[PDB]
Amino acid sequence: CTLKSFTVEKGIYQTSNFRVQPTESIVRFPNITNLCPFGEVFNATRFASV
């Protein structure tokens, strides 16, 4: 197919390349230390007035 003929001469011929596909995707972000005070935003003792 790559030589465009049905008969190929003696020799060694380059063809489609070899490629090791990735096994899977891995993601690594560091630890979490500070988070927004949702306990003071949504869990307030008494909500403000309109």
Epitope: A44, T45, R46
Partner: nanobody
Framework: VQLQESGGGLVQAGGSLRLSCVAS????????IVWFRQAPGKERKFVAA??????AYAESVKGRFTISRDNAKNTVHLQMNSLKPEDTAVYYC???????????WGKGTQVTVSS
């Protein structure tokens, strides 16, 4: 816990009263105060909110009410002038930071204006 309340009492017209609202803590310079009053048998209405260093009063309390704060002793003094019988109400004072948190409920003192 709660907010300590004082300054209430039963007085006749033309007298002088000074309500007090003190909130314990260590960040008084960032505290904001919202006031309310609840008349017996009537609706409870907002009185005066002194936030940062700004002051304001409602229709029936403007000029009559002279709100003030004491940064030295965490004290809020409200000078009372021009007593009116219809203003007999229980005043609930509120203390909070700029966020609106640290919400403590004031018990409220009995204030009466005699006709």
């Amino acid at each position: 816990v709660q907010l300590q309340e004082s300054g209430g009492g039963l007085v006749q017209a033309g007298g002088s009263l000074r309500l007090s609202c003190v909130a314990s803590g260590r960040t008084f310079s960032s505290l904001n105060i919202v006031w309310f009053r609840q008349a017996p048998g009537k609706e409870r209405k907002f009185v005066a909110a002194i936030n940062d260093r700004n002051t304001a009063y409602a229709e029936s309390v403007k000029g009559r009410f002279t709100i003030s704060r004491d940064n030295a002793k965490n004290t809020v003094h409200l000078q009372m002038n021009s007593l009116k019988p219809e203003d007999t109400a229980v005043y609930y004072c509120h203390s909070a930071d700029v966020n609106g948190g640290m919400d403590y409920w004031g018990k409220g003192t009995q204030v009466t204006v005699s006709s």
